[PDB]
Structure 1
Amino acid sequence: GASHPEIEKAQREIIEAFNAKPKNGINKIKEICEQYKISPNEEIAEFFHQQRKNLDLEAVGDYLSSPEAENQQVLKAFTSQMNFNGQSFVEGLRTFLKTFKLPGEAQKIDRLVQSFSGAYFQQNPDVVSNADAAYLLAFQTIMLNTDLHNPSIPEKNKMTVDGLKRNLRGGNNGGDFDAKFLEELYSEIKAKPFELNFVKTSP
C-alpha cells in the first residue's frame, strides 16, 4: 500500500490543491501519472487512503460517490484495496461505512454500498454467490441497523431472526443464505449498531 514515489514527493502540493479545489488536486495526480505512465485510478485511490488525515474528508466522500466514469473507477480501486477477507460481513460493512464522511444523498450512498458489495464478493466468492447477493445483504443489514435500534418502535414490531431469513429467501442468486450465517449477522448488528457519519446541509 504505497503511492508512486513522484506522487509521494508532490503530496504537499496535491493536498493543498485538493482541499481548495478537488478537481485541481485530482488533475495534478493525473498529470504526474501520465508522465510516469501509471494508472491514475489506482493512484488517486491510494492517495485517498494514504493522505486521509490531511484531506477534506467530505470532499473525498463526495468525489468517490459521484457518477462520473473516472470517479466510479477510483471508487472501485479504493474499495478493492480494503480487506474484506478474514473479517465478518457485518464487520466489513461497518468498517467500509466508517471510512466515509457520508454524503446526504440516497443515490450517492447507494453507489458506495454497491462498490462495497462488489468488493466483498470478489473477496468472499464462497460466502455470497455474486455482487447482487452481497448488495441485497448490505441493503438488508443497513435497514436492520436502523430499525432494530429505533427507540420509538415497540420491540414486538422489530424484525426477528426468523423474519430476516424469510426476507432474504432466494436472495443469494436464486438460492438462500445459510441460516446460521444470517443468525450471526443479526446478532452482530443487533449487538453493535453501525457508526455512520453524514455530512451537513450541503453535500
Structure 2
Amino acid sequence: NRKMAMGRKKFNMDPKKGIQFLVENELLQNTPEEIARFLYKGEGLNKTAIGDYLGEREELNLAVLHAFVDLHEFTDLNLVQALRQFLWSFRLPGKAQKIDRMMEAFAQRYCLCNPGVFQSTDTCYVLSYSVIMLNTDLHNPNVRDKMGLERFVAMNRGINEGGDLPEELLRNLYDSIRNEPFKIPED
C-alpha cells in the first residue's frame, strides 16, 4: 500500500527514520539480514542514503553492513572490478573511519569469494584502502600533483604481511583506476 513509498522517502530523508517507520508498520523485519536485503535491492532509495546508513558506527548498522556485503558476489573478479561492483551499490562516505569499516568488511568477502589471491584478509583490506586513496589522489581535483605508478607501488611496500605485493598486480590496479575513476553511483 501507500506506506511503503512513504517509508522509502523517509529513508532518503533520514535513513534511521525510514527503517524505524518500515519496521513499526510491519513492512520490514527488524533483522540485519532483512534490512540488508532491502538496501541491496535499493528500490526507490538514494545511494547516498544507503551509504550513510551502512556507515554508521552503531551495532545494528555494522551488522547490516556485514549482511549487505554477504549479498555481493565477488568470485572471478579482480580487486578493482569487485570494488567497482561494491561501490556501485551505495555511495561511499568520505569519512575515513567509515571507509575503513567498509573496506575491512569488503575485504573479508572478497577473500572468501577468491581464495588464495591474498594471503590474509588484512592484506586485502589495506590494499583496498590504498586503492581508495589512489582514486582520491588521481581524481579529486583538490589534489594537484598526481601519483605516478612508481609512487603508488612504493606506497604499498610492506603490506603483504610484512613483505611486498607483486608489481604486476599493483600496476594492473593503478592502470584501471587511472583510466576509469570509481563512478559516482546513479540511483
TM range (shorter): 0.7 to 0.9
Displacement of 1:43: 1.6
Q: Distance in 1 between matches of 2:54 and 2:140?
A: 29
Displacement of 1:85: 1.4
- After superposition, give the CA deviation of every residue in 1:92-131 in whole Å (9 maximum; x if it has no partner): 1122122213334333233222221222122223111222
Q: Could you state the TM-score of these two structures normalised by the residue count of structure 2?
A: 0.79
In the superposition, relative to structure 1, how do residues 58 and 164 fare at CA in structure 2: closer, same or farther (>3 Å)? closer
Q: Distance in 2 between matches of 1:119 and 1:30?
A: 31
Q: Could you state the TM-score of these two structures normalised by the residue count of structure 1?
A: 0.73
Match of 2:135 in 1: 145
Q: What does 1:72-111 correspond to in 2, within 5 Å?
A: 72-111=62-101
Paired residues of 1:58 and 1:101 also in contact (CA < 8 A)? yes
Structure 2 portions without partners, runs of 5+ = 11-16
- After superposition, give the CA deviation of every residue in 1:127-175 in whole Å (9 maximum; x if it has no partner): 1122221121112111211223466735xx6232x33333222212223
In the superposition, relative to structure 1, how do residues 145 and 27 fare at CA in structure 2: closer, same or farther (>3 Å)? same
The percent identity for this pair of structures is 37
- After superposition, give the CA deviation of every residue in 1:179-201 in whole Å (9 maximum; x if it has no partner): 2211211111111111135xxxx
Q: Distance in 2 between matches of 1:169 and 1:24?
A: 45
Tell me, yes or no, if structure 1 residue 23 matches structure 2 residue 23: no
Match of 2:165 in 1: 177
Q: Give the one of 110, 113, 117 matched to 2:107.
A: 117
Alpha-carbon RMSD across the aligned residues, in angstroms, is 2.8
In the superposition, relative to structure 1, how do residues 57 and 147 fare at CA in structure 2: closer, same or farther (>3 Å)? closer
Match of 2:47 in 1: 57
Task: Specify the code of the residue in structure 2 equivalent to 1:158.
Answer: M
Paired residues of 2:22 and 2:28 also in contact (CA < 8 A)? no
State the SS of the aligned residue for 2:87. Answer: helix
Structure 1 portions without partners, runs of 5+ = 1-9, 35-39, 198-203
Displacement of 1:18: 4.8
Task: Specify the code of the residue in structure 2 equivalent to 1:64.
Answer: L
Q: Distance in 2 between matches of 1:101 and 1:182?
A: 25
Q: What does 1:27-38 correspond to in 2, within 5 Å?
A: 27-28=23-24, 33=29
Q: Give the one of 139, 158, 166 matched to 2:154.
A: 166
Q: Distance in 2 between matches of 1:108 and 1:62?
A: 9
